[PDB]
Amino acid sequence: KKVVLGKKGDTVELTCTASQKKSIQFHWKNSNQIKILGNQGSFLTKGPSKLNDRADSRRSLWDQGNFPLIIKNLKIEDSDTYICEVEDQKEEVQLLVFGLTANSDTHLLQGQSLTLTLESPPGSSPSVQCRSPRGKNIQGGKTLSVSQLELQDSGTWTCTVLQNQKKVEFKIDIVVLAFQK
Amino acid sequence: LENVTENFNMWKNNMVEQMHEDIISLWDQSLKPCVKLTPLCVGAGSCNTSVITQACPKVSFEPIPIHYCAPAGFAILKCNDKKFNGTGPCTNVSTVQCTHGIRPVVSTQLLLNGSLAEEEIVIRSENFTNNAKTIIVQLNESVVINCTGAGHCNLSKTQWENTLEQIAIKLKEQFGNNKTIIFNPSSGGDPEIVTHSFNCGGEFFYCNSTQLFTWNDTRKLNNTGRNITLPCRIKQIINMWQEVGKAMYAPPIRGQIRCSSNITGLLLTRDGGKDTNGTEIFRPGGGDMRDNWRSELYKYKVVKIE
Amino acid sequence: DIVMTQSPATLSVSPGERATLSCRASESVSSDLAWYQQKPGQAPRLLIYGASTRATGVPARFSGSGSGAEFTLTISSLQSEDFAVYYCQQYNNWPPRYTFGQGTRLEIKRTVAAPSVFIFPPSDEQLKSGTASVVCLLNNFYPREAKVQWKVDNALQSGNSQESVTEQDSKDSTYSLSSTLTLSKADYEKHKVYACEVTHQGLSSPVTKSFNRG
Amino acid sequence: EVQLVESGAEVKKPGSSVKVSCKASGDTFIRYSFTWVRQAPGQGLEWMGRIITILDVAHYAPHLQGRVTITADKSTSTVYLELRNLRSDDTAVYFCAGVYEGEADEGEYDNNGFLKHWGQGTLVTVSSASTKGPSVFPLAPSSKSTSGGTAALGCLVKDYFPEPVTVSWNSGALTSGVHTFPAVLQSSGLYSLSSVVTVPSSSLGTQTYICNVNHKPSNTKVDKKVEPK
Ligand SMILES: *[C@@H]1O[C@H](CO)[C@@H](O)[C@H](O)[C@H]1NC(C)=O
Ligand SMILES: *[C@@H]1O[C@H](CO)[C@@H](O)[C@H](O)[C@H]1NC(C)=O
Ligand SMILES: *[C@@H]1O[C@H](CO)[C@@H](O)[C@H](O)[C@H]1NC(C)=O
Ligand SMILES: *[C@@H]1O[C@H](CO)[C@@H](O)[C@H](O)[C@H]1NC(C)=O
Ligand SMILES: *[C@@H]1O[C@H](CO)[C@@H](O)[C@H](O)[C@H]1NC(C)=O
Ligand SMILES: *[C@@H]1O[C@H](CO)[C@@H](O)[C@H](O)[C@H]1NC(C)=O
Ligand SMILES: *[C@@H]1O[C@H](CO)[C@@H](O)[C@H](O)[C@H]1NC(C)=O
Ligand SMILES: *[C@@H]1O[C@H](CO)[C@@H](O)[C@H](O)[C@H]1NC(C)=O
Ligand SMILES: *[C@@H]1O[C@H](CO)[C@@H](O)[C@H](O)[C@H]1NC(C)=O
Ligand SMILES: *[C@@H]1O[C@H](CO)[C@@H](O)[C@H](O)[C@H]1NC(C)=O
Ligand SMILES: *[C@@H]1O[C@H](CO)[C@@H](O)[C@H](O)[C@H]1NC(C)=O
Ligand SMILES: *[C@@H]1O[C@H](CO)[C@@H](O)[C@H](O)[C@H]1NC(C)=O
Ligand SMILES: *[C@H]1O[C@H](CO)[C@@H](O)[C@H](O)[C@H]1NC(C)=O
Ligand SMILES: *[C@H]1O[C@H](CO)[C@@H](O)[C@H](O)[C@H]1NC(C)=O
Incomplete structure (x- = not known):
């Protein structure tokens, strides 16, 4: 039961593979059995799904028995359990769309605390862990923070969203300041 | 008729795949693109496109009926019934030499010049429960449709209105009487599937079938219109039905291209809806020319000699 | 493999008059034939295409005629601006293997004007260089046909020298040849008289203009 | 368009x-x-x-x-x-x-x-060949050849590369009555053209003739006084 993590506003590719290398019938539906998009032999059929204008596969890979389901401009709500009915197989794959967005401007005085908010889907409990330009491995499940934003933290931060053996980077820029010298 | 009881499965009928492969080869020596592009991957994601450039002779591709006679050591079995699901035990089976003359018409959404349903309108489906399996409709009374390279097709608003009814009625007669039946245009996808595509005079027509599939089990659409006129368009760059890949055919030339075909059937595909209130939405479908072939071989099955 | 030959390699005609060009093709090219017009130093100009149809925004004096392997870009009352080389393009075979004609210069035919030969000796500064260049100009003349000969000490030697005609002008509409015998330093000094014989059509008789080192 | x-x-x-x-x-x-x-x-x-x-x-x-x-x-x-x-x-x-x-x-x-x-x-x-500015050499006005009306003189831009070259006379004034020939490729691999201007002899000794040759490629602009020498 595969699982894929994605960043809000990014493109994710839920795979789905056929046994042999042969372009055959396949179809992408979501938990509610709503058809996302399948194929009509050599043609692509897009269904009623709200992911319509953003769903899409890879014709080229169909012959290699591969029938992905690329979702672009990924939305938190796009998070779900997309089945893939192919040759009587149901490759139900999971999709989690997280979104890390700092609050106060990237520019923040020295000492003040830095608050991070992780937008996540319901029934989802990830564990984030950013890494300061120096090394602060501070942790925060859903909402992190840097108690005292030290001037040696003013730079690129490398967070991480852990959710089922997987994780997604979220590089963020932070700027510390002064009174001045 | 043959005095025996046998199993049939048009959805897993092998003649379909034997004709399909034939119809494809009937296309590689009649309609040859100026360029044909096709995916070529090792599996390593990266996929080069294999290009092929050959002569592009303008030929007025006019389909000839095709028979299918069992050779030897082989026999064709035909099923007989006014309403055959085409997937089960047939009682009035009967061995035949060759299957009726079939005109391999490649198209999407509408099945042209096929074979009408003797009794009434029949709709087969490998599983009506599965909103992913094409529903093949079989008209018992065809609806003439005339297309022209001039840019459109005319259809009888009358006949088409009736048809949607005698189809809309056969639908609920399978998904639940106390269920509203609606018809909407393609959900999305390739031009060949979203519109009623097909080939006429070797020209790939792409007719917008919105006026044919926007029927609400309530109102009409015959205000100031006697005939339905689908705004059709001929394309040169098309997605191949024979295999994933585009193909460019040379522009039109004959002073006039014209078609007058019998809408003998459709290819619908209701949307899941996730068990929502009785409001099944059926839209045009097809694109998998085999369903076509199927709609013609649904009652056949070749078998080895005993 | 298609060869497109434009028979009239050069066509001298006067303004207002009617000029005719003929493009000859190997096998039939049906009607996939276009005509172009090129001014010296300019990108071609799509005149006609499909054999007989003028490109958007083109003078109706240009007539596109033909079909098969015989095309013709006939022009009614030729115009001053209509001076240029004309090209026919074949684009009927497929796969794409388009070929161009070899050309046709639509030059203005005028009065046979004789050339006024100016022989210029090699500037000492240039001679101090290491070589010598004798320039034998041929100002304003018409039929570009002007045979020139370099005679060193009355020696018909024909080699180290290179001509260069100019385009048709604007006002005069004449040509100007320019033959240049480039000799050494030790051989320029080894010869006395350097003559340049111009044998033009509009020259009553051969006109040798030379000079002796000094 | x-x-x-x-x-x-x-x-x-x-x-x-x-x-x-x-x-x-x-x-x-x-x-x-x-x-x-x-x-x-x-x-x-x-x-x-x-x-x-x-x-x-x-x-x-x-x-x-x-x-x-x-x-x-x-x-x-x-x-x-x-x-x-x-x-x-x-x-x-x-x-x-x-x-x-x-x-x-x-x-x-x-x-x-x-x-x-x-x-x-x-x-x-x-x-x-290699990129190299030209060298202009004045063409002594035919003083012992042509007279009575006007005389022709000019320049000889020799040994330049790659191309092309612009030419103007008298800083860009006397551009009329001038015949600048197309360059010519010499066996060396270099090109050489010539510019000339048939002008009245009675103006030799007051209007210092100078062809203005430029060769952006080598970034070498050259001016040469064509004295009626
Ligand atoms: C392109 O496709 C070819 C397959 O013929 C493959 O061998 C090659 O690695 C790919 N890369 C190139 C040449 O673009
Ligand atoms: C006939 O149609 C019914 C309706 O769905 C289907 O269940 C059955 O498999 C078909 N064939 C038989 C066994 O009669
Ligand atoms: C089947 O066709 C007959 C006429 O051929 C028509 O009267 C009948 O109503 C049709 N059955 C339906 C409604 O599907
Ligand atoms: C019929 O379709 C349903 C879904 O619509 C599917 O769950 C079921 O397995 C199908 N029948 C079979 C056993 O193939
Ligand atoms: C289609 O054309 C046929 C002639 O082939 C004509 O009889 C029929 O009326 C036409 N159908 C239309 C335009 O509705
Ligand atoms: C339809 O469902 C049943 C028939 O199975 C009928 O008795 C009932 O009154 C109807 N209800 C609806 C869905 O309107
Ligand atoms: C024709 O089809 C297009 C999409 O293919 C649709 O957006 C448009 O509204 C349709 N026009 C008609 C005839 O209603
Ligand atoms: C279907 O219903 C909608 C809204 O009720 C209407 O706009 C549309 O025209 C109807 N389809 C037709 C043309 O019958
Ligand atoms: C609706 O229009 C059709 C022709 O398009 C006509 O035959 C029919 O009578 C009209 N409906 C009525 C009964 O007004
Ligand atoms: C088949 O289509 C033609 C074309 O309009 C029509 O005239 C003819 O009557 C139809 N024949 C059938 C299958 O009833
Ligand atoms: C049969 O249908 C085809 C559609 O491809 C059409 O071109 C042909 O004209 C029809 N038969 C007739 C009446 O010629
Ligand atoms: C069916 O209609 C809508 C479907 O979106 C649903 O909200 C409603 O509860 C159902 N019954 C009604 C109100 O008709
Ligand atoms: C045909 O009739 C005979 C009567 O003896 C019977 O044995 C056989 O099973 C029948 N076949 C069919 C149509 O089932
Ligand atoms: C097939 O045989 C059955 C059994 O007698 C009979 O009812 C039916 O009409 C026959 N079907 C036909 C017309 O072949």
């Missing part, structure tokens, strides 16, 4: 490779099929190939297959022409040319061979 812009003229050496750009603007890029047409000096048009842009397929000229390529960047809206293993004969003005094809982004495609829109042209000099 598109406007095609090309990359700069490049001086490549034998056996090398050159890539010329061609910016397409003013219309829908994918609706055009672009063709490269080269023309050697004095020579005439030679079909190099054509790219059915939208399809990203390109067919080439027999005598070029292997050593030429045509590609297009739909993102930046540019077409490129690459010739590898450059020979001297490849020296020519490479033109970028395009034609409208129809609602190609909609499946419609005329696939036209002619070329309606042409580029400004990019010159490519494939030679073993």
Whole structure:
């Protein structure tokens, strides 16, 4: 039961593979059995799904028995359990769309605390862990923070969203300041 | 008729795949693109496109009926019934030499010049429960449709209105009487599937079938219109039905291209809806020319000699 | 493999008059034939295409005629601006293997004007260089046909020298040849008289203009 | 109604490779099929190939297959022409040319061979020579040859490379009555032209004649006083 993590506003590719290398019938539906998009032999059929204008596969890979389901401009709500009915197989794959967005401007005085908010889907409990330009491995499940934003933290931060053996980077820029010298 | 009881499965009928492969080869020596592009991957994601450039002779591709006679050591079995699901035990089976003359018409959404349903309108489906399996409709009374390279097709608003009814009625007669039946245009996808595509005079027509599939089990659409006129368009760059890949055919030339075909059937595909209130939405479908072939071989099955 | 030959390699005609060009093709090219017009130093100009149809925004004096392997870009009352080389393009075979004609210069035919030969000796500064260049100009003349000969000490030697005609002008509409015998330093000094014989059509008789080192 | 812009003229050496750009603007890029047409000096048009842009397929000229390529960047809206293993004969003005094809982004495609829109042209000099400014040598006004009316004199821009060269007389004033000849390729690999101006002798000794030769390539601007010497 595969699982894929994605960043809000990014493109994710839920795979789905056929046994042999042969372009055959396949179809992408979501938990509610709503058809996302399948194929009509050599043609692509897009269904009623709200992911319509953003769903899409890879014709080229169909012959290699591969029938992905690329979702672009990924939305938190796009998070779900997309089945893939192919040759009587149901490759139900999971999709989690997280979104890390700092609050106060990237520019923040020295000492003040830095608050991070992780937008996540319901029934989802990830564990984030950013890494300061120096090394602060501070942790925060859903909402992190840097108690005292030290001037040696003013730079690129490398967070991480852990959710089922997987994780997604979220590089963020932070700027510390002064009174001045 | 043959005095025996046998199993049939048009959805897993092998003649379909034997004709399909034939119809494809009937296309590689009649309609040859100026360029044909096709995916070529090792599996390593990266996929080069294999290009092929050959002569592009303008030929007025006019389909000839095709028979299918069992050779030897082989026999064709035909099923007989006014309403055959085409997937089960047939009682009035009967061995035949060759299957009726079939005109391999490649198209999407509408099945042209096929074979009408003797009794009434029949709709087969490998599983009506599965909103992913094409529903093949079989008209018992065809609806003439005339297309022209001039840019459109005319259809009888009358006949088409009736048809949607005698189809809309056969639908609920399978998904639940106390269920509203609606018809909407393609959900999305390739031009060949979203519109009623097909080939006429070797020209790939792409007719917008919105006026044919926007029927609400309530109102009409015959205000100031006697005939339905689908705004059709001929394309040169098309997605191949024979295999994933585009193909460019040379522009039109004959002073006039014209078609007058019998809408003998459709290819619908209701949307899941996730068990929502009785409001099944059926839209045009097809694109998998085999369903076509199927709609013609649904009652056949070749078998080895005993 | 298609060869497109434009028979009239050069066509001298006067303004207002009617000029005719003929493009000859190997096998039939049906009607996939276009005509172009090129001014010296300019990108071609799509005149006609499909054999007989003028490109958007083109003078109706240009007539596109033909079909098969015989095309013709006939022009009614030729115009001053209509001076240029004309090209026919074949684009009927497929796969794409388009070929161009070899050309046709639509030059203005005028009065046979004789050339006024100016022989210029090699500037000492240039001679101090290491070589010598004798320039034998041929100002304003018409039929570009002007045979020139370099005679060193009355020696018909024909080699180290290179001509260069100019385009048709604007006002005069004449040509100007320019033959240049480039000799050494030790051989320029080894010869006395350097003559340049111009044998033009509009020259009553051969006109040798030379000079002796000094 | 598109406007095609090309990359700069490049001086490549034998056996090398050159890539010329061609910016397409003013219309829908994918609706055009672009063709490269080269023309050697004095020579005439030679079909190099054509790219059915939208399809990203390109067919080439027999005598070029292997050593030429045509590609297009739909993102930046540019077409490129690459010739590898450059020979001297490849020296020519490479033109970028395009034609409208129809609602190609909609499946419609005329696939036209002619070329309606042409580029400004990019010159490519494939030679073993090296970039070097010219040297102007005054041509003594025929004082002992022509008289009575006017006399002709001029300059002799010799041994320059690669190309091209502009010429004007008297800082740019006496540009009338002048016949600047097309350059000529010398066996050395260098070019040499000549400029002349038939002017009245009675003006020799007051109007110091000076042909103004420029050669941006070498970035060498030269002025030479053509004294009635
Ligand atoms: C392109 O596809 C070919 C398959 O013919 C493959 O071998 C190659 O690695 C791919 N890369 C190139 C040349 O673009
Ligand atoms: C006949 O149609 C019914 C209706 O769905 C289907 O269940 C059955 O498999 C078909 N064949 C038989 C066994 O009669
Ligand atoms: C089947 O066709 C007959 C006429 O051929 C028509 O009267 C009948 O109503 C049709 N059955 C339906 C409604 O599907
Ligand atoms: C019929 O379709 C349903 C879904 O609509 C599917 O769950 C079921 O397995 C199908 N029948 C079989 C056993 O193939
Ligand atoms: C279609 O054309 C036929 C002739 O082939 C004509 O009898 C019929 O009326 C036409 N159908 C239309 C335009 O509804
Ligand atoms: C339809 O469902 C049943 C028939 O199975 C009928 O008795 C009932 O009154 C109807 N209800 C609805 C869905 O309107
Ligand atoms: C024709 O089809 C297009 C999409 O293919 C649709 O958006 C448009 O509204 C349709 N026009 C008609 C005839 O209603
Ligand atoms: C279907 O219903 C909608 C809204 O009720 C209407 O706009 C549309 O025209 C109807 N389809 C037709 C033309 O019958
Ligand atoms: C609706 O229009 C059709 C022709 O398009 C006509 O035959 C029919 O009588 C009209 N409906 C009525 C009964 O007003
Ligand atoms: C089949 O189509 C033609 C074309 O309009 C029509 O005239 C003819 O009556 C139809 N024949 C059938 C199958 O009833
Ligand atoms: C049969 O249908 C085809 C559609 O491809 C059409 O072109 C042909 O004209 C029809 N038969 C007739 C009446 O010729
Ligand atoms: C069916 O209609 C809508 C479907 O979106 C649903 O909200 C409603 O509860 C159902 N019954 C009604 C109110 O008709
Ligand atoms: C045909 O009739 C015979 C009567 O003896 C019977 O044995 C056989 O099973 C029948 N076949 C059919 C149609 O089932
Ligand atoms: C097939 O045989 C059955 C059994 O007698 C009979 O009812 C039916 O009409 C026959 N079907 C036909 C017309 O072949």
